[PDB]
DNA sequence: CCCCCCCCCC
DNA sequence: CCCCCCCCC
């Protein structure tokens, strides 16, 4: 099962080679600072290891503070996320979540907690190689990214989008799996 | 049993391909936020049915690791409640994803309904955010702004109608009863 | 034993198909839920019988992970009580779904009746919300507003009558007793 | 041993069939509730014997997960006590159902007797509500509003008589001792 | 060992039949309750002997899960003590039943004797109520009001006399010592 | 080892029969209660010897689950102490019986003697009450009022004399040493 | 190893026979209680050697489950200390007996010496009372008043003399060392 | 699985030799301390990639045993935060090294960013110091003063340029998917 | 390994015989207690060597279950410390003996030395009292007053001198290294 | 895996011989203590490399059992911090050594840097002292005063130069990667 | 592995013989202890080397069960610190010895140095006293007063000189690496 | 009510 | 939107 599977030579070789790849400009985004968006990291991990080849859990989440300054809330929240592969290999790291200025205590806490968990997951997956987000920390890679042409955001083709719940091929394979 | 079943090549490959699909406009809904901005989301029951179809009714599981009420404040007769929950989804092979949901209830005068609303919302949100990590088909694509742009350019479709003619009308499931009798 | 048996292909397919079924109007009832509007729901005993038919009396299980009384407040002689419960349903293959229920009692003068109402409602609500996660047939469809529109357009049927002629009248079960004697 | 035995096809089907039965009027009793209304219920010993017949003396089990005294109040010499209990019933195959019972005692001048009544009543109620989840035959049908009306239309029968001629009069059980000696 | 032995068909059926037996008048005793009314009961030693005969000296077991002193109050020189106990009986196959006993001592001037009486009574009562759940032969029939009337209609027999001629008079048990020597 | 050995048919039946025996007058002792009534009991060493002969020196065991000093009060220079103990007896097949003992010391001026008396008495009483549950031969019959009447009508026998001619006089046990040397 | 070895028939019967023996006057010692009455007891080392001979140096074991200092009081320069200990003896077959010992120290000016005396006495007394439960040969007979009377009528023998001619004078044990070298 | 793999002779020897290598100037960075002096270090991503190449992406793992915030102080509008972390790295053969990292933030006006900086720095520092213990190739050589001197004498090379032509541009990994499909 | 080995017949009997031996005057020492009385004891190292020869350096073991400082008092400039320790000796067959030692230091002005003395003495005393329980050869006879009288009648011998000519002078143990190399 | 491997004769003998070697002056360093004196020590990275060469990168491991900050004092604006750490080193055969390290930081005005220095120094010192216990080669000889005098009499060598020509300049390890590919 | 290996006859006998050896004057040193006179002791590194030679680098292990700082007191600028530690030594066969060490620092002005001295001394002292229990060769004889007298009569030899010609000069151990390479 | 407990016991 | 008044008395 999970945590018991040992990587075969072919799969080990494919993943080890693939994880060295640096990410193209399609993955990187910027704010006012470069970063990779959460769903992109999720999709990267799902493609690298399979939907059932990686796992993550929240070891502990701790609210550092909730302060009130003339009607505005300032909240800091840390989270400890541990990623595990289907072979037992694991990486655990710290994420943080901040919410300053909001008037809603509850919305501030929601933003801070969710942000902390997502950040922790990104930083835990980072430790597997450049393909999962390590290259973003290399300043030479950032410069080589700035010299690249700023391409416009690609468009998504919703023609083959999932339109009904049923997955007939999946149901067939699962019925044949028993 | 559960957590021990190992995925066969056919089911693994089918699921891996199927999870890449982004969701059509049938799944996505929208509300208005505190900044007057549009926020998309998938309704709970849609995600539950999506997961039941992707993994089988017995191929996925979820549990509440911890639910914690952050605060209960009383402002001139109105209750403001924040509740977080940690939901862990597991597949029949032991693979798991755990995330946090939050639940908010501001303005209500009934403390009990505020707490109920916050707790249930927190748990459902945590389940959705935990299931997100399995792929676009279970809700990962909703975070892609390009997917959102491609969704607005689409015609606002009218609510589909449900045909309740073959709806279940009595408890017994005879084919199910036979299949189970033959299992003992 | 329980939690160890793996579903056979025939029973898996039967149950997966049956769980997709939406519920007819015989199951749906209405009360005034949280929010003060008319809200549809499935009665507890109906969900119990639904689950017993879907999985068998020994094919599903549930337990109360934790029940916590959030508060008991007294406002000029009336009691206001909120109670949450965490109920986890498990199938005979180890598959599980856990959710939160809440129980409310505001205004009553009897503390004991208020607490009893809140605790029992919390447990039953948690069980229903945990069973929701297996498919439409166990209560997931009730959350689809399109399903509600398709339910209102249906002819309002009168409550069916129960024929108590073949009702159980003595304790002994000879058919069961024989199979059990031969099972040892 | 217990929790390990798997139900055989014959015993499973027999029990699944028997549990669908609604109960005849011999089981149901009634009192006058709060608002000058009628409320039906099944007495504890009836449910105990029903379970012993359905599963065998060694085919079902129950335990008290937790009992918590909610309150003990003193108003001018009278004690008012509320007690909840969490009872978990388990079958010989590991299947389980857990629910909450409550126990109330208002008016008594003895704190000890109030607590005794409340605790025992809570536990018995919890056992009844836990056994309810196995099917109609163990008490689920009592929740059906149509079933109660269909029960009122039957002629109210007078208490059947019990013939104590074959009552056990001395301790020794020779057939049991013989089979048990043959068990070694 | 204990909790592992599985009941053989003959012993299962013998015990299942024997537990249906209602108890004769030799077992029932009576005291007066608070409202000056008759309350029936089975004495502790009677239940112990019944259980030893039904299952064997090594076929049933009981343990005190938890005992909690609810209160010890002093009212003008008299002590009033209430004590609850949770007793769990288990059979040699792992089957179990757990229930609550209570112990009361009101009026005594000695705290120590009040506590002793309350604790011991709680434990014994809990054992009786746990054994009750196996069937009429172990004490369930005492709860049937119809069974009680048929007991009043019976002639109250004078206390049976005990023939102490075959009483054990010295420690050695040669047949037992021999059977055990042959076990090594 | 202990707790695993399963009783052989011969030893089971021998012990089951022997435990039914009531005790002769050699075992019973008496003290006086204040109301002019007589209270019977079996002395500690007598119960220990009874158990050693019934089960063997290595066929029964007991342990102190918990001992709790309820109170130690000082009233005008005199100490009044109540102590409870929970003793669990276990047989070599895993069968067990657990009960409560109490120990009392009122009036003594030495706190140390009060505590020692109460603790030791509690433990011994708990052992007696736990062993009682195995049958009449180990002390259950002492609670039967008819057995008490049949005991009082018997001629008061003079204290038996002990023949110390074959008493153990030196440490070495040669037969035991030889049997154990062959056991390695 | 220890706790797993099962007693062989020869050793079981030999030990069972030997444990029935009462002790001669060589073992019994006496002091005067605080009320001028005669109190018998067995010295610690005598009981230790008794157990070593009955079961072997490696056939019995004991451990201190818990030691609790009940009180340490200071009255005009003198310390009064009560300490209880719970000692559990176990045989190589898993059989066990647990009892309580007490240790007292009144009058001493040194708190440390008082505590040392009380703790050591509590533990030794607990070991004696735990070993008592194995039979008369290990100290059970000391509680029989008839044995005490038969002890008084026996001639009080003068303290035996110890022959230190065959005493161990150097550390080395050549026979033991040889038997052990052949054991590897 | 992980923690079970034993290093093969070829892989052990390869890694043992490779870890002896000291690092070239491409890895080392430097800053100025609070007292105007040069401090060398290895950046986090370099250590992560070094370890991934030395042991494989699945041949090393690390976990946070505990993170403890030492202090958060507010001095006239500036926050000073010290946080320690204990990081444990493990290899696929069970070999492990655990060390401490620290995180500092002095002067900042935002508490949230101070805490984020201190916690993340503590964890990364602990990871670097834990990996340091495996050899020079993973960072031990940075502590050799002679290695630092021999590094300064080297020509300061210009920052290398990165060729992003072969960068990953889409999610799909066909070779990886193929090998994994062949792994089921 | 340790705790698992079962004693072979030869070594068992050798040790069983050897443990009966009383100790010659070379082992016994004496001090003067507070009442000017002669108190006998065996020095620690002698008991350690006794055990090392009786069971082998690897045939017995001891551990400190708990050490508890009873008090540390400061009375007019001097420290008075009492410390108890619970030492459990175990043999290579799993047999064990646990007892309490005490350590005292009264009068010293340095707290640190008082604590050191009390703790170390408590541990050593506990080890001596635990080893005593195996038989006379390890110190049980020292408690026999008859043994003490038989010790006084012997001539007080002068301290034996130790021959340090064949003393160990370098670390290496060549025969040991050879035997160990041949064990791998 | 780790903790399971048994040392082969060749590797055992090699390591046992190698650990006796004392360290040359290349390893030893010196500082000035509080009395203007010479204190010798081995720098951390040297000890890490020593252990990695003696046992292999995967043949030794260490963990931090506990680190405890003893004190943080503020004396006229400067911080003085003492921190202890407990480091446990384990070999691939399960052999282990645990010792204490300390860390000090006096004079700094930054609390965070003081704590960082003290914690890191404590952990490194504990690792050095734990590895010391394996033999002279890992640092035990540094405690021999004769070793120190014989160290002064040797010619003080110039700091060796480091040859960075073959330093690792890129991440990939082709020999390691190939040896690992052949291991799956 | 460690804790599982059983000693072979040859190695057991060699080690048992070697442990009897008393130590020559090369090992013994003298300082001013808590008795206020010339007190003999074995230096830490000597005991470590003794153990490494007696059992092998991988044949003995020790751990710190607990270290507890008893007190830190400040008297006119000087610190008085007492620290105890519990060290447990174990051999490769599971045999173990656990004892207490103490560490003292009185008079020093630096709190950090006092705590460091006390903790390290406590751990080292505990290790020495735990190793004492294995025989004279590891330090038991140092307590023998006759051994001390026989040590004074020996010629006081001058500090031995160490031959550092074959001192270890580089990290690599080629023979060790070869023996390990062939072990995989 | 009473008995348990008060007075006695150490 | 609930909460209040209703319901339990």
DSSP K57-118: TTTEEEEEEEEEEEEEEEETTEEEEEEEEEEEEEETTS-EEEEEEEEEEEEES-HHHHHHHH
Q: What angle do CA G102, G107, G109 make, to 5 degrees?
A: 115
- Torsion sign (Cα): G140, G145, G150, G155: positive
Interatomic separation, CA of residue I108 and C1' of nucleotide L2, rounded (Å): 62
Structural tokens at position E138: 């172990």
Task: End-to-end CA distance of chain I: give it in Å, rounded.
Answer: 16
Residues of J in contact with K74 (CB under 8 A): none
The closest nt to F106, taking CA to C1', is L5
Which of B97, B54, B62, B104 is closest to B79 using CA atoms?
B104
Report the C-alpha gap between G140 and F46 in whole angstroms: 9
- Torsion sign (Cα): D172, D175, D177, D178: positive
CB-count exposure of residue B77 (10 Å: 0-12, 13-18, 19+)? exposed
Between 2.30.30.240, 1.10.10.10, 3.30.390.80, 1.10.10.920, what CATH number should domain A8-149 receive? Answer: 3.30.390.80
Structural tokens at position K12: 């057991």
Measure J92 CA to nearest chain K CA, in Å: 9
Nearest residue: Cα versus C1' of L6: F107
What K36-45 contacts at long range (C-beta under 8 Å, 24+ apart), as own/partner pairs, is K40/K142, K40/K148, K40/K151, K41/K142, K42/K128, K42/K139, K42/K142, K43/J143, K44/J143, K44/K124, K44/K127, K44/K128, K45/J140, K45/J141, K45/J143, K45/J144
* Cβ distance of K7 and G184 shorter than 8 Å: yes
Report the C-alpha gap between B124 and K120 in whole angstroms: 55
* Cβ distance of C16 and A178 shorter than 8 Å: no
Residues of A in contact with C7 (CB under 8 A): 178
What G102-107 contacts at long range (C-beta under 8 Å, 24+ apart), as own/partner pairs, is G102/F112, G102/F115, G102/F116, G102/F119, G102/F120, G102/G126, G104/F112, G104/F113, G104/F116, G105/G79, G105/G80, G105/G81, G106/F110, G106/F112, G106/G78, G106/G79, G106/G80, G106/G81, G107/G78, G107/G79, G107/G80
Which of K159, E135, G82, D115 is closest to F117 using CA atoms?
G82
- Resolution in Å, one decimal place: 3.0
Judge H/K contact: 3 or more CB pairs < 8 A: yes
Which of D70, D131, D86, D80 is closest to D110 using CA atoms?
D80
The closest nt to B108, taking CA to C1', is M2
Interatomic separation, CA of residue F146 and C1' of nucleotide L3, rounded (Å): 23
Structural tokens at position F177: 């040493």
Q: Does residue F178 sit in helix, strand or coil?
A: helix
For residues A116-144, one letter each, b for 16 or more C-beta atoms within 10 angstroms of the residue's C-beta and e for the rest, the string is bbbbbbbbbbbbbbbbbbbbbbbeebeeb
Report the C-alpha gap between C22 and C43 in whole angstroms: 15
Residue located via tokens 């008393």: K22
Q: What are phi and psi of E164, to 5 degrees?
A: -85, 20
Of I10, I98, I129, Cβ closest to residue G183: I10
Report the C-alpha gap between C158 and F45 in whole angstroms: 77
* Cβ distance of F184 and I16 shorter than 8 Å: no
| Three-state DSSP string of F106-128 | EEECCHHHHHHHHHHHHHHHHHH
K132: left (phi over 0), alpha (psi -120 to 50) or beta: alpha
Q: Are D67 and D110 in contact (CB under 8 A)?
A: no
**What are F87's strand-pairing partners?**
F64, F99
Q: What are phi and psi of C107, to 5 degrees?
A: 105, -20
Residues of H in contact with B13 (CB under 8 A): 181, 184
Report the C-alpha gap between K70 and K114 in whole angstroms: 13
**Alpha-carbon separation of residue G24 from A54, F66, F167, F174, G164 (angstroms):** 76, 36, 5, 17, 23
Q: Please give the distance of CA A178 from its chain centroid, rounded to a whole number.
A: 33
Report the C-alpha gap between J17 and F51 in whole angstroms: 63
Q: What is the dihedral of CA H88, J46, K103, K75, to 10 degrees?
A: -100
Chains that touch F (3 or more CB pairs under 8 A): D, E, G, I
Interatomic separation, CA of residue E113 and C1' of nucleotide L5, rounded (Å): 10
* Cβ distance of F12 and D181 shorter than 8 Å: yes
Report the C-alpha gap between J153 and J25 in whole angstroms: 11
The closest nt to F112, taking CA to C1', is L10
Give residue ranges of B with CB < 8 Å to any D CB.
Answer: 177, 180-182, 184
Structural tokens at position D22: 């609604």
Query: Count of C–D CB contacts within 8 Å?
Result: 164
Structural tokens at position C102: 């809440």
Third-level CATH fold of B8-155? Enolase-like; domain 1 (3.30.390)
CB-count exposure of residue B24 (10 Å: 0-12, 13-18, 19+)? middle
Residues of G in contact with I143 (CB under 8 A): 43-45
Q: What angle do CA F138, F144, F147 make, to 5 degrees?
A: 90
Report the C-alpha gap between E122 and E65 in whole angstroms: 12
Q: Are E119 and F122 in contact (CB under 8 A)?
A: no
Q: Are G83 and G65 in contact (CB under 8 A)?
A: no
Report the C-alpha gap between B35 and F93 in whole angstroms: 72
* Cβ distance of F5 and E3 shorter than 8 Å: no
Which of E67, D65, J104, B168 is closest to C66 using CA atoms?
D65
The residues of the protein lying within 7 Å (CB) of strand L read E 107-110, 113-114; F 33-35, 76, 78, 80, 106-110, 113; G 33-35, 37
| Three-state DSSP string of chain J | CCCCCCCCHHHHHHHHHHCCCCECCCCEEEEECCCCCEEEEECHHHHHHHHHHHHCCCCEEEEEEEEEEEEEEEECCEEEEEEEEEEEEEECCCCEEEEEEEEEEEEECCHHHHHHHHHHHHHHHHHHHHHHCCCHHHCHHHHCHHHHHHHHCCCCCCCCCCCHHHCECCCCCHHHHHHHHCCC
* Cβ distance of K100 and I111 shorter than 8 Å: no
Q: What angle do CA G24, G27, G30 make, to 5 degrees?
A: 110
The closest nt to F35, taking CA to C1', is L3
Helices (H) then strands (E): counts for chain B: 5, 5
Report the C-alpha gap between I107 and I118 in whole angstroms: 12
* Cβ distance of H57 and A88 shorter than 8 Å: no
Structural tokens at position G143: 């509680």
Q: What are phi and psi of F182, to 5 degrees?
A: -75, -10
Report the C-alpha gap between A88 and J63 in whole angstroms: 20
Residues of C in contact with B162 (CB under 8 A): 22, 144, 146-147, 149-150
- Residues whose CB falls within 8 Å of the CB of residue G59, separated by 6 or more in sequence, listed in order: F180, G91, G92, I95
Q: DSSP for H7-45, please give it.
A: PPHHHHHHHHHHHHPPBPTTTEEEEE-TTS-EEEEE-HH
Which nucleotides on strand M sit less than 7 A from a protein beta carbon? 1-9
Report the C-alpha gap between J13 and J19 in whole angstroms: 10
Residues belonging to chain F:
184
> In chain D, whose CA is at the least distance from the CA of F20?
D172
Q: How many CB atoms lie within 10 A of CB B44?
A: 19
**Alpha-carbon separation of residue I91 from E107, I54, K65, K89 (angstroms):** 56, 11, 21, 16
Report the C-alpha gap between C88 and H56 in whole angstroms: 40
The residue among E168, E171, E179, E182 with the most chain F CBs within 10 A of its CB, best to mutate, is: E168
Q: DSSP for I137-164, please give it.
A: GGTGGGG-HHHHHHHHTS--PPPPPP-G
Taking the domains of chain H in order of start, what are their residue ranges?
A: 8-155
Report the C-alpha gap between E42 and E37 in whole angstroms: 17
Measure G10 CA to nearest chain E CA, in Å: 9
* Cβ distance of B2 and C50 shorter than 8 Å: no
* Cβ distance of F181 and I6 shorter than 8 Å: no
Nearest residue: Cα versus C1' of M2: C35
Which nucleotides on strand L sit less than 7 A from a protein beta carbon? 1-10
């Amino acid at each position: 099962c999970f945590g018991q599977c040992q990587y075969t030579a072919e799969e080990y070789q494919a993943i080890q080679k693939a994880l060295r790849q640096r990410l193209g400009p399609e993955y990187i985004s910027s704010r006012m600072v470069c970063y990779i968006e959460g769903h992109r990291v999720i999709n990267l991990a799902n493609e690298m290891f399979g939907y059932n080849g990686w796992a993550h859990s929240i070891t502990q989440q701790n609210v550092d503070f909730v302060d009130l300054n003339n009607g505005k809330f300032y909240v800091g929240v840390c989270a400890f996320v541990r990623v595990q592969l289907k072979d037992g290999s694991y990486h655990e790291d710290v994420g943080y979540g901040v919410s300053e200025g909001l008037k809603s205590k509850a919305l501030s806490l929601e933003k801070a907690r969710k942000e902390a968990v997502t950040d922790g997951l990104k930083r835990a997956l980072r430790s597997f190689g450049n393909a999962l987000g390590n290259c973003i920390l290399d300043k030479d890679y950032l410069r080589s990214l700035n010299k690249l042409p700023r391409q416009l955001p690609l468009e998504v083709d919703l023609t083959k989008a999932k339109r009904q719940d049923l997955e007939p091929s999946v149901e067939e394979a699962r019925y044949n799996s028993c």
